[PDB]
Recover the amino acids of this structure.
C-alpha cells in the first residue's frame, strides 16, 4: 500500500463523518499502523474508531492542555515501543465559538472566544508539532487541514482569521521540522458535509448562514473543473495520504488544494 | 493639500521614530486635522506630539481595554464636535512579547504571550474599526500597518502569524466598513529604523537576530528596484496618506506595498 | 492639483468611453500637461481628444511598429521641448482577436492570433517602456492597465493569459526602470462599460458570452464591499493618477486593485 | 507500483539529465507503460531512452508543427492499440532564444524570439492537451513543468514571462480537460543541474549569469527548510508521478511546488 508500514498519529476523529475518520480509514487501507487521539468524549470516540478497518489505540489529547501535550510523546512511545518512531502526524482539529463563526456580527465576537478558537485552530498546529517531533523519524510528514482563507466570505468570520494564522504557523513549523528532516504541509479542502455542516443546512446557525452555505456549495461544484461532491470526503483523505507518503518529498511549508480546482476559477 | 480639511485619527505614536509620528506629520502638512491616541505613557507621548507641525489633541487608548474602546467614539465627538465625523483612521499598533519575536524558539512561545500579541496586533484592527465607524463619514478610510507575512523568516516568528491574521481581519473589516461607505486597507512597509530596530542592530534581541536583521535589510535594498532606505519613514507615511485621500476610491480589503518593490523580486 | 506641472504621455484613447480617455481627463483636471498617442484611426481620435478638458498634441503609435517605437522619444521631445522630459507614461492598450477572446473554444485559437494579442497586450508594455525611458525624469512613473488573471474565467480566455504575462513583464520593467529612478506598476480594474463591453451586452460576442459577462458583473458589484459601478470609469482614472503622483513613491513592480475590493471577497 | 498499468506519454527527453528522463525512469519503476516523444534529434534521443529501465516507443513531436500535433492522437493509438487510451501526459518542454534568457538586456529581446519561446514554453501546453485529450481516459492527468515566476529575477527574463503565461494556460486547460474528467496541473521545481545548467556554471551564458545562478542556488538550499540538491532530480520526478497517480484526485488547475519549501521562506 501507499503507506505500508508507516506509523501515523491521527487527531480529530469525533464522528464517522469527521474528515479525520476518512483519513484514518484510507491510511489503514494503505498499510499504515495508526495511533489515534481524541478530545473529551473518549467513550463516544472509541465507538466510532471501532468501525475503522483495523484496530488502533486511542490516546486522550486536549490541545489546550499543556500536560497532555507534554506527556504525548511518552504516551506514544508506550504504545508503539520505545525504540520506534512515527512517520506521520495528522492535525485535523478546529474550533470557533458561535460568537466567531455563524450569524453573529464579525465585530461582536469577544476576544476570549476568538482567542480560544485561535488556540485550538492555529496555535495548536505548532503545539502538536513540538509535542510529536521528538518521536518522529527523519523523512516524516506532518499534515494539517485548511479551508482557503485568502478571501473573506460570509459566516466563516473569525475561523477564516484562524486559518490565515494557521497557514503562517505551518510555514514556521516547516522551518523547525525541517531541521530533523520532517515535512509540514496543509491540505486546503473544499466544503465537506460533516454532521455540523448538515446542521447548517437545517438552519442551526441561522437561516441566513444556511442560505450563504448553499450558495457557496453550489458555486464550488460549478467552478471546480472536475466538480466537487461535498458528500464525498475520500478525495480529501487521499490527498492527505499523498502528503504522508514519500511521493511529495520536496514539498514543505506548503498548501495543497483538494478542492476540485475551485480556487483556480473565478466563475 | 492632499488631505485638506479631513479629520483623521492617528494611533500608535510613542517616539519621534514611530511610523505613526511620520504619518501624522505628513498628514498635517497636507491639511489634515488630527486627533491622536496614545497608550500608557501619555506624558511622554505628549512631549513627542508637541513636535508635530501643528497642535492636536491626545486621547488615551489601550486597545485591550474595552472601556477605552467603548468610550472612544464619544471622546472623539467631544473634541471634534458632536455634529462632525472622522474621515480617516490610522491603526499603527503592534506588540509581541520577547518570547514570540526575537531569538526564543518559535515552539517555546507560551500561548498567553502569543494571545496578547495577537490581541494587540491583529484583533485590535477590528476592535478599533468597530469603535470608530459610528463616528466616520461615508467615503472615509481606515488604514493599518503590515509587514509582509506571506513567507516565514528569522526572528519575526509569531509576529508574522499576527500579521497574517491582521491581513485576514482587514478583509472582514472591509466588509463591515463598506456597508457605511468606508474603505479599509493595509500598507505593507519595508523595514524602518525605529528606536526598537536600532536596539536590534545593537544586539538587544541577541547577536543572531542582529545578524539576521542586517541580512534582511541589505537584501531588501538590493532587491528593491528603486532601493529601500530603512532610515527614511517618509515614503511609508506618504503611502498611508495616499490611502487616506480620495485618490484610491475603489481599493478596499487590500494591501498596498510601500517596500521599494522588494517583494516583487526574488533576488 | 495632484499632478501639477507633470508631463504625462497617455496611450490608448479610441473613444470617449476608453479608460484612457478618463485617465487623460482626470490628469488634465489635476494640472498635468499631456502628450497623447493614437493607433490607426488618427482622425477619429483627434475628434475624441478635442472633448478633453484641454487640447493636447497627438502622436501616432502602433506598438507593433518598431519604427514608431524607435522614433517615439524624439517625437515626444519635439512636442514637449528639447531638454524637457516626461514624468509619467500610461499604457492603456490591449487587443486579442476574436479567436482568442469570446465564445471560440480556448483550444482553437490559432497561434498567430494569440501571438498578436500577446504582442499588443503584454510585450508592448516592455516596448513602450524601452521607447520612453530615455525621455523620462528620475522620479517618474509608468502605469499599465490590468484585469486580474489570477483565476481562469469564461470568455476572457487568451486575454487572461496575456494579462498574466503582462504582470510578469511589469516586474521586469520595474527592474529596468528603477535603475533610472522610475516606477512601474499596473492598475487591476474591475469591468468597465466601454463601447465594446456594451456590444457584449448586446450579444456581439454571442449570447453565451453576454450571459457570462452579466453573471460576472452582478457578482462583482455584490462581492465588492463598496460596490462596483461598471458605468463609472472615474475611480479607475483616479487610481492611475494616484500612481502617477508622488504619493506612492515606494511602490514598484506592483499591482494596485481598483475593483471595489471584489477580488478580496469569495462571495 | 504507484502507476501500475497506467499508460503515460512523456515529452521532453533530450539527455539523461533532462527532468523528463527522470520522470520516465520513476514512472517505469512504478509500473507505467510509456510512450515517449522527442524533438528534432531523434537518433540521439533513442540512444538516451535505451538507458531507461524499460525500452519504450518514441514518437516525433515538434510542438510548433501543427501536422505533428494533428496526427499525434492517431500515432499514439498506433502505439498503444486502437481502443486503448492514455492515463497521463507529461509536458516537460521549454525554450527561449539567448536574446530572451541570459545576459542580454530584457528590453532588447526581439519580439520574434520572445514569441517563439512563448509558443514552445506556454502555448504548447494547450496545444499538447488539445492533441492528446481525445485519446485520454476519464480520470487521467496532464502535468507540466514550471519554475516559479511570481517574482522577477536575474537572467531568467522572458522565460519568466513565459512561465507566468504557462500558469494561466494551465488554469484554462484544467477547465477544458475537466469536462472529460482529466486533471491538469503544474509542478514548480527548484533549480536542477541539467547539462545546460552545468554550462551556465561554466560561463556559457556569461560570467554574470553564472554568478547570479550560483547566488540563486546557494540561497535556495539555505531557504528550503529541508534543503535543496540541484544535482538530484528524483524528488521532482516523484512529485510528477504523484500527480499522475490517483492520490491527488481533487487537485486541478493548480501548481504543486517541488522546491524544498524554498518559496515559502523569505530568508
Ligand atoms: N468540514 C469542512 O467543510 C472542512 C473544510 C476544510 C477544512 N476543514 C478542517 O478540517 C478539520 C477537521 O474538521 P471536520 O470538518 O472534520 O470536523 P470535526 O468536528 O469532525 O473535527 C474537528 C475536530 O477537532 C477536535 N477538537 C476540538 N477542540 C479540540 C481540542 N481542544 N483538542 C483536540 N481536538 C479538538 C474535535 O474533537 C473534532 O474531532 C478542521 O481543521 C476543519 O477546520 C473542514
Ligand atoms: N518598524 C518597521 O520596520 C515596521 C515595518 C512594517 C510594519 N510595521 C508596523 O507598523 C506599526 C507601528 O510600528 P512602529 O515600527 O512604528 O513601532 P512603534 O513602537 O513606534 O509603534 C507601535 C505602537 O503600538 C502601540 N501599542 C502597543 N500596545 C498597545 C495597546 N495595548 N494599545 C494601543 N497601542 C498600543 C505602542 O504604544 C506604539 O505606539 C506596527 O503595526 C508595526 O508592526 C513596522
Ligand atoms: N474595459 C474593461 O473592463 C477593462 C478592465 C480592466 C482592464 N482593462 C484594460 O484597459 C486597457 C484599455 O482598454 P479599454 O477597456 O479602455 O478599451 P479601449 O478599446 O478603449 O482601449 C484599448 C486601446 O488599445 C489600443 N490599441 C490596440 N492595438 C494597438 C496597437 N497596435 N498600438 C497601439 N494601441 C493599440 C486601441 O486603439 C485602444 O485605444 C486595456 O489594457 C484593457 O485590457 C479594461
Ligand atoms: N532545469 C531546471 O532548473 C528547471 C527548473 C524548473 C522547471 N524546469 C522546466 O522543466 C522542463 C524541462 O526542462 P529541463 O530542465 O529538463 O531541460 P531539457 O533541455 O532537458 O528539456 C527541455 C525539452 O524541451 C524540448 N523542446 C524544445 N523545443 C521543443 C519543441 N519545439 N517541440 C518539442 N519539444 C521541444 C527539448 O527538446 C528538451 O527535450 C521545462 O519546462 C523547464 O522550463 C526546469
Ligand atoms: C458557511 C461556510 C463558509 C460554508 C463552508 C464551511 C466549510 C468548513 C470549514 C471549517 O473549517 C469547518 C470546521 C470549523 C471548526 C471546527 C470543525 C470544522 C467546517 O465545519 N466547515 C465553512 C462555513
Ligand atoms: C528581524 C526582522 C525580520 C527585521 C525586520 C523587522 C521589521 C519590523 C516589523 C514589525 O512589525 C515591527 C514591530 C512589531 C511590533 C511592534 C512594533 C513594531 C518592527 O519593529 N520591525 C522585523 C524583524
Ligand atoms: C466576459 C468578460 C470576462 C467580462 C469582463 C471583461 C473585462 C475586460 C477586460 C479587458 O481586458 C478588456 C479589453 C481587452 C482588449 C482590448 C480592450 C479591452 C475588456 O473589454 N473587458 C472581460 C470579458
Ligand atoms: C539563472 C537562473 C535564474 C537559475 C535557475 C534556472 C532554472 C531553470 C529554469 C528553466 O525553465 C530552465 C529551462 C528553460 C528552457 C528550456 C529548458 C530548461 C532551466 O534550464 N533552468 C533559470 C536561470
Ligand atoms: Na464544475
Ligand atoms: Na536595489
Ligand atoms: Na457589494
Ligand atoms: Na535550508
Amino acid at each position: 500500500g501507499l503507506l505500508e508500514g508507516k506509523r501515523i498519529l491521527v487527531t480529530g476523529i469525533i464522528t464517522d463523518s469527521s474528515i479525520a475518520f476518512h483519513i484514518a480509514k484510507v491510511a489503514q487501507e494503505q498499510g499504515a499502523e495508526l495511533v489515534l487521539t481524541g478530545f473529551d468524549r473518549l467513550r463516544l470516540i472509541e465507538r466510532i474508531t471501532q468501525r475503522l478497518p483495523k484496530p488502533a489505540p486511542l490516546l486522550e489529547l486536549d490541545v489546550q492542555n499543556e500536560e497532555h501535550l507534554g506527556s504525548l510523546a511518552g504516551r506514544i512511545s508506550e504504545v508503539i515501543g520505545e525504540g520506534n518512531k512515527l512517520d506521520g502526524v495528522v492535525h485535523s482539529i478546529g474550533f470557533m465559538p458561535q460568537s466567531g463563526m455563524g450569524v453573529n456580527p464579525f465585530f461582536d465576537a469577544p476576544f476570549a472566544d476568538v482567542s480560544k478558537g485561535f488556540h485550538i485552530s492555529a496555535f495548536s498546529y505548532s503545539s502538536l508539532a513540538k509535542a510529536v517531533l521528538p518521536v518522529m523519524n527523519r523523512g516524516g510528514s506532518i499534515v494539517g487541514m485548511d479551508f482557503d482563507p485568502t478571501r473573506a466570505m460570509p459566516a466563516y468570520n473569525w475561523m477564516t482569521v484562524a486559518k490565515s494564522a494557521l497557514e503562517s504557523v505551518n510555514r514556521f513549523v516547516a522551518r523547525e521540522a525541517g531541521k530533523v528532516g520532517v515535512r509540514s504541509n496543509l491540505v486546503a479542502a473544499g466544503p465537506i458535509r460533516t454532521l455540523a455542516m448538515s446542521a447548517i443546512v437545517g438552519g442551526a446557525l441561522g437561516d441566513e448562514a444556511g442560505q450563504q452555505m448553499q450558495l457557496l456549495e453550489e458555486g464550488w461544484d460549478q467552478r471546480a473543473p472536475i466538480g466537487w461532491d461535498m458528500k464525498d470526503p475520500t478525495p480529501v483523505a487521499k490527498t492527505v495520504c499523498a502528503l504522508l507518503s514519500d511521493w511529495l518529498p520536496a514539498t514543505t511549508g506548503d498548501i495543497i488544494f483538494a478542492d476540485g480546482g475551485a480556487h483556480t476559477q473565478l466563475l
Residues D 12-15, 18-20, 39, 61-64, 92-95, 120, 145, 147, 189, 191-192, 194, 196-197 surround nicotinamide-adenine-dinucleotide (ligand 4) (CB under 6 Å).
